[PDB]
Amino acid sequence: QALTEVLLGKTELLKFYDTLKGLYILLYWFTSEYSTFGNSIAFLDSSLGFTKFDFNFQRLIRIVLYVFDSCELAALEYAEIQLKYISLVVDYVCNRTISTALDAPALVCCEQLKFVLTTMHHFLDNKYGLLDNDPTMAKGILRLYSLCISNDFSKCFV
């Protein structure tokens, strides 16, 4: 809710910052695996890689993409917190893989795959998230390509 009044421009600066950061950490808790948060919380009640947090998260990430297109800031710390959400979007899709022994960890939801792919693609398309000596976007790209080395999802990657 507080995310939406930065559109109307009357938002603060540090309150803006920790509003984004608290949103980020509330995302990060619920982006964890099934072992950490089990069925204790009522949107993660459903198993099989397929939760109520899925579509609500795909809503709120598009909302914060809309907020990032709404805002216009080239701050260094804004680039720093801007890399965090793509770190979160690759961490959201990494842990829902089946995570076998030594083969590449196969995903469960090709829609979640397409979501993270198109999300970081739209991220990069708008010249978003540029900061010095920062391997975070590189890690995300390499992890998702490692998921899509030679499986059926390689065409989905391209």
């Binding site: 421009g9 009640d45 459903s46 890689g49 109520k52 961490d91 030594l102 992890r143």
Partner: protein
């Protein structure tokens, strides 16, 4: 200190993104995109179709008529009107492609998957009455495609397997059924994403009646079960009970519900949970109703999850001649399919363990719905859940500890979760727990509690040293898992500052103990203690309880 706005916020056209996603929508396994396969489709029996300026000629390219509709309604409608326009139009399309004797229905699976992609793209704008119309269309669509989930248990002695060994019609309607139930699951999760005030528009009696018929059709008893549709059908009930929990006006929904719907669901859930999971005869065809076995002739991914290997994806591509306009299917000889790795069997076991987890999860959910007692909160979730807990502990200890398959941890998480399913049923729902049914399960309940109360001795672990040898013995697979995660797929897993691998040398060890069936968590031991020791029921007497305490010492 105010952040400045963007004067040229390029909000992308969301229906353009949606249209582009439709056009490039391709299922996992086939060569061409779904729209492009629809371009290779005609229908030479319905010589003309039209519903609402949706003219399809006799030899017309069907996906060309689709994209005519797409581009036409793109210029006109907003997002939700574009969606439900496509929903009802392709629904009527699927409808009269279905209701015809001589017609092949090869367009129908791609139409259903197309419609699924239509629904799930933006659930925020997708309207619930359109969900209801599409939902009832899929329900009576499956009662049209009736005989698929009603192939009998056994063939006759003279039911010959002489046959043209055709697979194409089987592939058509298996994809129809599977994508249909997948779409039902999709409708109900996007309906779940619709807010907690807006369900009575979706829900009436016909919803429950149609799903009750197709649910008895799905979790069949006298017929061969397709495991694919069982996944979907129980995930539906999961979404149902979940939104019943997460709405305020559950009373109107449960008053719409007759208890017959409950007690007809719960029997099929019990008969499902009393099945077994064995890797060596997953992909074998065997005795019914005990082995969720995921038959060879329906082995693909599906719309939500990638349930198998998708051996059939190249066959989905070879369903069409791809250089030709046709409606009859391209050939699939049925037994050309089919020794390298039973890792396929292990991951299919992983799916089925998640499935039984979901079964006991919705048991948990319906108990939390009916905190009060009813026809179905009636004690049989002591019996059936206790039988499951006891068997998945006993032959866990007999068969699994030392079999180094990846499924051991989730198979022993099943017992860890159904312990709590026993526990809160015991503590909070004792009022209905009849004196007869506890004696119907008196052995297995108390023995299952004792298999945790034997773990309060703590005479295996006591250190760090030998336990990591034991996890070399049985838990090298999780070592592979955590080395792959530590080496590639975790931000926090590098340059470990000697407080965070201190967590690892506790948690891998308690995890491998939980595998090794000694040293569970003390809270689970206490939950097993506060049922048997508790005087709510005379499980043991005091002169019988010490006969179990001596079986540890004490």
């Amino acid at each position: 200190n105010m952040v400045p706005l963007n004067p040229n916020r390029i909000i992308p056209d969301e229906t353009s993104l949606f249209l582009e996603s439709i056009l490039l929508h391709q299922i996992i396994g086939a060569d061409l995109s779904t729209i492009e396969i629809l371009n290779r489709l005609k229908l030479d029996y319905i010589t003309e179709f039209k519903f609402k300026n949706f003219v399809i000629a006799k030899g017309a390219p069907i996906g060309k008529s689709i994209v005519s509709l797409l581009l036409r309604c793109k210029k006109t409608l907003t997002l939700d009107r574009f969606i439900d326009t496509l929903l009802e139009d392709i629904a009527v399309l699927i409808k009269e492609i279905s209701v015809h004797p001589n017609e092949s229905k090869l367009a129908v699976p791609f139409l259903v998957a197309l419609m699924y992609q239509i629904v799930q793209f933006r659930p925020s704008a997708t309207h619930n009455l359109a969900l209801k119309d599409c939902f009832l269309f899929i329900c009576d669509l499956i009662r049209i495609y009736h005989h698929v989930l009603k192939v009998p248990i056994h063939e006759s002695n003279m039911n010959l397997h002489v046959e043209p060994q055709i697979f194409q019609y089987e592939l058509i309607d298996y994809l129809i059924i599977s994508y249909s139930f997948d779409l039902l699951e999709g409708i109900l999760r996007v309906l779940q994403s619709h807010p907690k005030q807006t369900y009575m528009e979706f829900f009436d009696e016909n919803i429950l009646k149609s799903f009750e018929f197709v649910y008895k059709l799905a979790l069949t008893i006298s017929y061969k079960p397709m495991v694919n549709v069982i996944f979907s059908a129980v995930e539906v009930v999961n979404i149902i009970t979940s939104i019943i929990l997460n709405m305020d006006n559950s009373s109107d929904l449960k008053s719409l519900i007759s208890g017959s719907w409950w007690r007809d669901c719960i029997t099929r859930l019990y008969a499902l949970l009393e099945k077994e999971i064995k890797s060596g005869d997953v992909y074998n065809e065997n005795v019914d109703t005990t082995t969720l076995h995921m038959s060879k002739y329906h082995d693909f991914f599906g719309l939500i999850r990638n349930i198998g290997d998708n051996e059939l994806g190249g066959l989905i591509s070879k369903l069409i001649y791809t250089d030709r306009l046709q409606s009859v299917p391209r050939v699939i000889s049925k037994e050309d399919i089919g020794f390298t790795a039973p890792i396929i069997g292990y991951k299919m076991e992983k799916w089925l363990l998640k499935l039984k987890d979901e079964v006991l999860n919705i048991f948990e959910n319906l108990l939390m719905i009916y905190g009060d007692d009813a026809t179905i909160v009636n004690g049989e979730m002591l019996i059936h859940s206790s039988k499951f807990l006891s068997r998945e502990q006993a032959l866990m200890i007999e068969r699994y500890v030392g079999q180094d398959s990846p499924n051991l941890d989730l198979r022993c998480h099943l017992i860890e979760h159904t312990l709590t399913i026993i526990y809160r049923l015991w503590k909070d729902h004792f009022k209905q727990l009849r004196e007869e049914q506890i004696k119907q399960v008196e052995s297995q309940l108390i023995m299952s509690l004792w298999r945790f109360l034997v773990c309060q001795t703590e005479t295996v672990t006591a250190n760090e040293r030998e336990m990591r040898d034991h996890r070399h013995l049985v838990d090298s697979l999780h070592d592979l898992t955590i080395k792959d995660q530590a080496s590639y797929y975790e931000d926090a897993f590098e340059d470990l500052p000697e407080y965070i691998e201190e967590e690892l040398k506790m948690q891998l060890n308690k995890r491998t103990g939980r595998i090794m069936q000694v040293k569970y968590d003390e809270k689970f031991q206490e939950m097993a203690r506060t049922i048997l020791e508790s005087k709510s029921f005379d499980l043991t007497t005091l002169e019988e309880a010490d006969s179990l305490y001596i079986s540890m010492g004490l």
